[PDB]
Amino acid sequence: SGEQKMAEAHELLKKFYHHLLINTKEGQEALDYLLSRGFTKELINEFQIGYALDSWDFITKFLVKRGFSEAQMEKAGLLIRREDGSGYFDRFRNRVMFPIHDHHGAVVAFSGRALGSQQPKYMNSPETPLFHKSKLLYNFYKARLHIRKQERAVLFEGFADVISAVSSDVKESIATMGTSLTDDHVKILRRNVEEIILCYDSDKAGYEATLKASELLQKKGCKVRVAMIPDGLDPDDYIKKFGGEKFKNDIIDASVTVMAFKMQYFRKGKNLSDEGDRLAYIKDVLKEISTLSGSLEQEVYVKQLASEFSLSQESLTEQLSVFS
């Protein structure tokens, strides 16, 4: 009953935030800045992007005038209570507003991109009775039927990368919102598709998240591949530098196995010209190879090691047996 109040406010605010972006003077600085970073108004209306004015109480007064309890709206994640107990203010101020739809198309939260210095850069609704990030996959309600048509899903972190991908014609794109992939997410993904492509940031945190996401996904029978962004780029940086078509064609459609990805990951921080690092890398890769099913799959990757380092397969195989 109170949850229905929080839902109706979110539906209303999506329309209004969008209205302020498209139809007011204040919205201009955000609208122009959006267009200047690749947004088309086809995208703005498609994702119903909006703008929250740079005020403390504009939406607080807006909701109270319309009969909404401030404390409900605080439980909804829309307002914050003054630490000193004097009242309530707008959680989302001077941000570009991205609505977060649950898997049936109902708005349950927002993500706001700071225009300016306020922190965080990206502010998200907290846990509310409506919004549980451990079960929601951003863009899933729009992506579901593309995931089934393409027989694959492309999994990002954060909404920004998803919108760049959709723009790049990867409509089977979804993301986690401020959280690692969870078992609830894997159960939803598995019900809908077998193939999953991870496309994460290429910094050290992204690499650990890729490794962790793919262990959860493989345990449940998902066929997993890894999109690998070259240099030190995140997906959106690639899309802007080279364009959506190259991203789709040479990144998403050339994604590699989990084992091929580990074989790159395990290289970082190692000097493969140093005998100790060279050996540790090899042994680390053979330990992963030993968890693969079947000699054929194992042999495929043992052969890359034999070839890249000019080592006999006999001694790589002898070391493999140790681990198994």
Short mmCIF file of C-alpha atoms in Angstrom, two decimals:
data_model
loop_
_atom_site.label_atom_id
_atom_site.label_comp_id
_atom_site.label_asym_id
_atom_site.label_seq_id
_atom_site.Cartn_x
_atom_site.Cartn_y
_atom_site.Cartn_z
CA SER A 1 0.00 0.00 0.00
CA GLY A 2 2.80 2.39 0.88
CA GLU A 3 4.82 0.60 -1.78
CA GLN A 4 2.13 1.63 -4.28
CA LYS A 5 2.75 5.24 -3.24
CA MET A 6 6.48 4.84 -3.95
CA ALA A 7 5.67 3.30 -7.34
CA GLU A 8 3.30 6.08 -8.42
CA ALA A 9 5.82 8.76 -7.45
CA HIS A 10 8.50 7.08 -9.55
CA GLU A 11 6.22 6.81 -12.59
CA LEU A 12 5.30 10.49 -12.18
CA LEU A 13 8.88 11.68 -11.64
CA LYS A 14 10.10 9.83 -14.76
CA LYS A 15 7.62 11.83 -16.86
CA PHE A 16 8.42 15.08 -15.03
CA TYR A 17 12.21 14.79 -14.98
CA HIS A 18 11.97 14.03 -18.72
CA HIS A 19 9.72 17.09 -19.10
CA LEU A 20 12.24 19.33 -17.33
CA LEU A 21 15.08 18.10 -19.57
CA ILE A 22 13.21 18.57 -22.87
CA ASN A 23 10.96 21.57 -22.14
CA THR A 24 12.60 24.03 -19.68
CA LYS A 25 15.52 26.49 -19.71
CA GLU A 26 17.24 24.79 -16.76
CA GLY A 27 17.20 21.54 -18.76
CA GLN A 28 19.22 23.18 -21.55
CA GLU A 29 22.67 22.86 -19.97
CA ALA A 30 21.98 19.15 -19.46
CA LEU A 31 20.31 18.67 -22.85
CA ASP A 32 23.17 20.28 -24.75
CA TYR A 33 25.77 18.45 -22.70
CA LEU A 34 23.94 15.19 -23.48
CA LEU A 35 23.87 15.82 -27.22
CA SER A 36 27.55 16.80 -27.03
CA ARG A 37 28.39 13.30 -25.73
CA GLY A 38 26.61 11.29 -28.43
CA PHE A 39 23.01 11.27 -27.18
CA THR A 40 20.34 11.61 -29.84
CA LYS A 41 16.87 12.68 -28.88
CA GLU A 42 15.77 9.33 -30.27
CA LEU A 43 17.84 7.96 -27.39
CA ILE A 44 16.66 10.54 -24.86
CA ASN A 45 13.02 9.73 -25.56
CA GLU A 46 13.85 6.01 -25.86
CA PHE A 47 15.46 5.80 -22.44
CA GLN A 48 13.27 8.66 -21.08
CA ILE A 49 16.31 10.47 -19.75
CA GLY A 50 15.43 13.45 -17.58
CA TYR A 51 16.87 16.26 -15.49
CA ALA A 52 16.57 17.10 -11.80
CA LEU A 53 16.82 20.85 -11.18
CA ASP A 54 19.67 22.24 -9.06
CA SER A 55 17.42 22.82 -6.04
CA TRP A 56 17.19 21.47 -2.50
CA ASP A 57 13.41 21.15 -2.20
CA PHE A 58 11.86 21.51 -5.66
CA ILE A 59 10.81 17.84 -5.85
CA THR A 60 10.17 17.70 -2.08
CA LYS A 61 7.60 20.47 -2.46
CA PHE A 62 6.45 18.89 -5.73
CA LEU A 63 5.56 15.58 -4.07
CA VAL A 64 4.06 17.07 -0.89
CA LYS A 65 1.82 19.38 -2.93
CA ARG A 66 0.51 16.24 -4.67
CA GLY A 67 -0.33 14.46 -1.41
CA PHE A 68 2.84 12.42 -0.83
CA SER A 69 4.24 11.78 2.61
CA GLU A 70 7.86 12.90 2.93
CA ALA A 71 8.73 9.84 5.02
CA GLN A 72 7.27 7.48 2.42
CA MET A 73 9.30 9.34 -0.23
CA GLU A 74 12.35 8.90 1.99
CA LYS A 75 11.71 5.14 2.15
CA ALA A 76 11.31 5.32 -1.65
CA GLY A 77 14.82 6.75 -1.96
CA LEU A 78 13.54 9.98 -3.51
CA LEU A 79 14.32 12.31 -0.56
CA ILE A 80 16.83 12.49 2.26
CA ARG A 81 16.00 13.46 5.83
CA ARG A 82 18.06 16.27 7.31
CA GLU A 83 20.57 14.73 9.67
CA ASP A 84 19.37 17.44 12.10
CA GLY A 85 15.71 16.38 11.83
CA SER A 86 14.38 19.72 10.54
CA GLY A 87 12.92 18.29 7.32
CA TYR A 88 13.59 16.74 3.94
CA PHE A 89 15.49 17.65 0.75
CA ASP A 90 15.88 16.33 -2.81
CA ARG A 91 18.25 13.38 -3.09
CA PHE A 92 18.67 14.06 -6.81
CA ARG A 93 19.78 17.65 -7.50
CA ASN A 94 21.35 18.96 -10.74
CA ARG A 95 21.72 15.50 -12.27
CA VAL A 96 20.87 13.90 -15.58
CA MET A 97 18.22 11.34 -14.63
CA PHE A 98 18.15 7.75 -15.86
CA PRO A 99 15.07 5.76 -14.75
CA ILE A 100 15.62 2.21 -13.54
CA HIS A 101 12.87 -0.12 -14.70
CA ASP A 102 12.22 -3.47 -13.07
CA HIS A 103 11.75 -6.51 -15.29
CA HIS A 104 8.11 -5.59 -16.10
CA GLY A 105 8.63 -1.96 -17.21
CA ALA A 106 7.71 -0.28 -13.88
CA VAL A 107 10.02 2.45 -12.55
CA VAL A 108 11.58 1.51 -9.21
CA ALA A 109 14.57 3.85 -8.86
CA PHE A 110 16.86 6.31 -10.65
CA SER A 111 20.50 6.92 -11.43
CA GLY A 112 21.64 10.53 -11.61
CA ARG A 113 24.73 11.75 -13.44
CA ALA A 114 26.22 14.82 -11.74
CA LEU A 115 26.47 17.95 -13.86
CA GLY A 116 29.21 19.39 -11.71
CA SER A 117 31.30 18.44 -8.70
CA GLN A 118 28.79 16.79 -6.34
CA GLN A 119 29.56 13.28 -5.18
CA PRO A 120 29.04 10.68 -6.20
CA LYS A 121 29.42 11.26 -9.91
CA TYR A 122 26.61 8.72 -10.37
CA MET A 123 24.08 8.81 -7.52
CA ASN A 124 21.77 5.79 -7.27
CA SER A 125 18.62 5.23 -5.25
CA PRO A 126 19.54 3.13 -2.19
CA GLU A 127 17.81 -0.12 -1.25
CA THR A 128 14.09 0.69 -1.16
CA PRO A 129 11.06 -1.62 -0.88
CA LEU A 130 10.93 -1.15 -4.67
CA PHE A 131 14.58 -1.41 -5.69
CA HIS A 132 16.85 -4.38 -4.91
CA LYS A 133 20.01 -4.12 -7.03
CA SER A 134 20.83 -7.76 -6.28
CA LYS A 135 17.85 -8.89 -8.38
CA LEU A 136 17.42 -6.18 -11.01
CA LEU A 137 19.30 -6.09 -14.33
CA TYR A 138 19.24 -2.65 -15.88
CA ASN A 139 17.58 -2.61 -19.34
CA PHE A 140 16.36 -6.21 -18.93
CA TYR A 141 12.71 -5.45 -19.66
CA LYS A 142 13.62 -3.88 -22.99
CA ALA A 143 16.41 -6.36 -23.72
CA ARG A 144 14.55 -9.61 -22.96
CA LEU A 145 13.19 -10.21 -26.45
CA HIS A 146 16.42 -9.16 -28.08
CA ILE A 147 18.32 -11.57 -25.84
CA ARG A 148 16.05 -14.35 -27.11
CA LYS A 149 16.26 -13.33 -30.76
CA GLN A 150 20.06 -13.03 -30.68
CA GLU A 151 20.38 -16.12 -28.40
CA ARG A 152 22.86 -14.22 -26.23
CA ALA A 153 23.05 -11.52 -23.59
CA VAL A 154 25.80 -8.92 -23.19
CA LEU A 155 26.44 -8.01 -19.55
CA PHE A 156 27.93 -4.63 -18.53
CA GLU A 157 28.38 -2.81 -15.24
CA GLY A 158 26.37 0.37 -14.95
CA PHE A 159 23.76 1.88 -17.21
CA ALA A 160 26.17 4.08 -19.19
CA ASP A 161 27.77 1.17 -21.01
CA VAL A 162 24.38 -0.36 -21.77
CA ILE A 163 23.11 2.77 -23.49
CA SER A 164 26.28 3.04 -25.57
CA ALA A 165 25.84 -0.62 -26.56
CA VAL A 166 22.15 -0.25 -27.50
CA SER A 167 23.18 2.77 -29.57
CA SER A 168 25.79 0.48 -31.19
CA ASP A 169 22.93 -1.94 -32.07
CA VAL A 170 23.70 -4.41 -29.22
CA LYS A 171 20.13 -4.43 -27.91
CA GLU A 172 20.64 -7.64 -25.90
CA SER A 173 22.50 -5.52 -23.30
CA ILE A 174 21.87 -5.39 -19.56
CA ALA A 175 23.89 -4.34 -16.54
CA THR A 176 24.34 -4.58 -12.83
CA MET A 177 23.64 -1.34 -10.92
CA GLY A 178 26.34 -0.72 -8.32
CA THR A 179 26.86 -4.39 -7.43
CA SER A 180 28.66 -7.53 -8.50
CA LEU A 181 26.69 -10.13 -10.43
CA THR A 182 24.68 -12.21 -7.94
CA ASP A 183 23.10 -15.66 -7.92
CA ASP A 184 19.66 -14.09 -8.41
CA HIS A 185 20.90 -12.42 -11.61
CA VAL A 186 22.35 -15.71 -12.85
CA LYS A 187 19.05 -17.51 -12.24
CA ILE A 188 17.21 -14.89 -14.32
CA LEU A 189 19.84 -14.91 -17.07
CA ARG A 190 19.90 -18.71 -17.22
CA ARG A 191 16.11 -18.94 -17.64
CA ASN A 192 16.34 -16.79 -20.75
CA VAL A 193 19.57 -17.67 -22.56
CA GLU A 194 22.61 -19.94 -22.56
CA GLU A 195 25.30 -17.63 -24.00
CA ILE A 196 26.56 -14.66 -21.90
CA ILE A 197 29.23 -12.16 -22.99
CA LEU A 198 30.98 -10.16 -20.26
CA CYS A 199 32.04 -6.66 -21.33
CA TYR A 200 33.61 -4.96 -18.31
CA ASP A 201 36.12 -2.19 -17.65
CA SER A 202 39.69 -3.16 -18.52
CA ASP A 203 41.24 -1.86 -15.29
CA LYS A 204 42.27 -4.24 -12.51
CA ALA A 205 38.86 -4.03 -10.80
CA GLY A 206 37.08 -4.90 -14.04
CA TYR A 207 39.36 -7.90 -14.56
CA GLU A 208 38.56 -9.27 -11.08
CA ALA A 209 34.87 -8.66 -11.67
CA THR A 210 35.04 -10.49 -15.01
CA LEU A 211 36.72 -13.47 -13.36
CA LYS A 212 34.15 -13.52 -10.53
CA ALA A 213 31.12 -13.05 -12.79
CA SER A 214 32.19 -15.91 -15.06
CA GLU A 215 32.63 -18.43 -12.21
CA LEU A 216 29.04 -17.79 -11.10
CA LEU A 217 27.82 -18.08 -14.68
CA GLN A 218 29.72 -21.28 -15.57
CA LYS A 219 28.60 -23.10 -12.41
CA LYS A 220 25.03 -22.82 -13.76
CA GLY A 221 25.74 -24.12 -17.26
CA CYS A 222 25.91 -20.73 -18.93
CA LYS A 223 28.20 -20.61 -21.92
CA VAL A 224 30.38 -17.58 -21.16
CA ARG A 225 32.64 -15.47 -23.36
CA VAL A 226 34.59 -12.31 -22.58
CA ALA A 227 34.65 -9.12 -24.63
CA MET A 228 38.12 -7.68 -24.21
CA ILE A 229 38.59 -3.93 -24.69
CA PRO A 230 42.16 -3.11 -25.83
CA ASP A 231 44.50 -0.55 -24.22
CA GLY A 232 43.06 0.86 -21.02
CA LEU A 233 39.52 1.63 -22.18
CA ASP A 234 36.07 0.98 -20.89
CA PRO A 235 33.30 0.08 -23.40
CA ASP A 236 31.95 3.61 -23.79
CA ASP A 237 35.47 4.96 -24.42
CA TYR A 238 35.91 2.39 -27.18
CA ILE A 239 32.55 3.22 -28.77
CA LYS A 240 33.40 6.91 -28.88
CA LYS A 241 36.94 6.38 -30.21
CA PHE A 242 36.07 3.83 -32.93
CA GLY A 243 32.30 3.80 -33.27
CA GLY A 244 29.50 1.39 -32.46
CA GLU A 245 29.99 -0.79 -35.53
CA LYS A 246 33.60 -1.62 -34.73
CA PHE A 247 32.62 -2.22 -31.11
CA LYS A 248 29.92 -4.70 -32.09
CA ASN A 249 31.94 -6.36 -34.87
CA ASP A 250 35.43 -6.62 -33.41
CA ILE A 251 34.76 -6.53 -29.64
CA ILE A 252 31.41 -8.16 -28.91
CA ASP A 253 31.44 -10.59 -31.86
CA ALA A 254 35.12 -11.54 -31.28
CA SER A 255 34.75 -12.23 -27.57
CA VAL A 256 36.94 -15.08 -26.38
CA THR A 257 36.59 -18.02 -24.06
CA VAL A 258 36.95 -17.66 -20.31
CA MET A 259 40.16 -19.69 -20.54
CA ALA A 260 41.58 -17.44 -23.25
CA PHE A 261 40.70 -14.47 -21.02
CA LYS A 262 42.43 -16.00 -17.97
CA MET A 263 45.48 -16.61 -20.17
CA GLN A 264 45.63 -12.82 -20.69
CA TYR A 265 44.68 -11.79 -17.17
CA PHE A 266 47.36 -13.97 -15.55
CA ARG A 267 49.99 -12.14 -17.63
CA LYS A 268 49.44 -8.81 -15.86
CA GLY A 269 52.16 -7.84 -13.39
CA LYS A 270 54.49 -10.58 -14.69
CA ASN A 271 57.68 -10.17 -16.70
CA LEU A 272 57.54 -13.28 -18.90
CA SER A 273 61.22 -12.76 -19.77
CA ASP A 274 62.10 -13.48 -16.13
CA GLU A 275 62.45 -17.21 -15.51
CA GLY A 276 60.51 -17.08 -12.24
CA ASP A 277 57.60 -15.08 -13.67
CA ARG A 278 57.55 -17.18 -16.87
CA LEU A 279 57.27 -20.38 -14.83
CA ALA A 280 54.63 -19.04 -12.43
CA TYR A 281 52.49 -17.84 -15.33
CA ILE A 282 52.74 -21.23 -17.00
CA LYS A 283 51.93 -23.11 -13.81
CA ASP A 284 49.04 -20.74 -13.05
CA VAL A 285 47.56 -21.43 -16.50
CA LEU A 286 48.01 -25.20 -16.20
CA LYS A 287 46.16 -25.14 -12.90
CA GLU A 288 43.15 -23.54 -14.60
CA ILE A 289 43.50 -25.93 -17.57
CA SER A 290 43.31 -28.86 -15.13
CA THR A 291 39.75 -27.82 -14.17
CA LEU A 292 38.60 -28.08 -17.81
CA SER A 293 36.50 -31.06 -18.87
CA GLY A 294 38.18 -33.47 -21.24
CA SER A 295 41.60 -33.95 -22.77
CA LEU A 296 40.61 -32.24 -26.04
CA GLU A 297 39.79 -28.89 -24.44
CA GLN A 298 42.87 -29.20 -22.25
CA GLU A 299 45.12 -30.05 -25.18
CA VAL A 300 43.96 -27.00 -27.12
CA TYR A 301 45.32 -24.64 -24.49
CA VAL A 302 48.39 -26.69 -23.58
CA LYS A 303 49.33 -26.26 -27.26
CA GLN A 304 49.23 -22.44 -27.05
CA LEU A 305 51.62 -22.62 -24.09
CA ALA A 306 53.88 -25.09 -25.90
CA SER A 307 53.92 -22.82 -28.91
CA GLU A 308 54.32 -19.38 -27.34
CA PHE A 309 57.19 -20.53 -25.10
CA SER A 310 58.73 -23.29 -27.26
CA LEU A 311 58.24 -25.83 -24.49
CA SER A 312 57.64 -29.51 -25.06
CA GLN A 313 54.09 -30.65 -24.44
CA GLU A 314 55.48 -33.62 -22.51
CA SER A 315 56.71 -31.42 -19.68
CA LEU A 316 53.63 -29.18 -19.69
CA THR A 317 51.51 -32.36 -19.52
CA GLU A 318 53.64 -33.78 -16.71
CA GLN A 319 53.06 -30.54 -14.77
CA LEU A 320 49.34 -30.64 -15.59
CA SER A 321 49.00 -34.12 -14.02
CA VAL A 322 50.47 -32.77 -10.78
CA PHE A 323 47.57 -30.33 -10.45
CA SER A 324 44.97 -33.03 -11.20
#
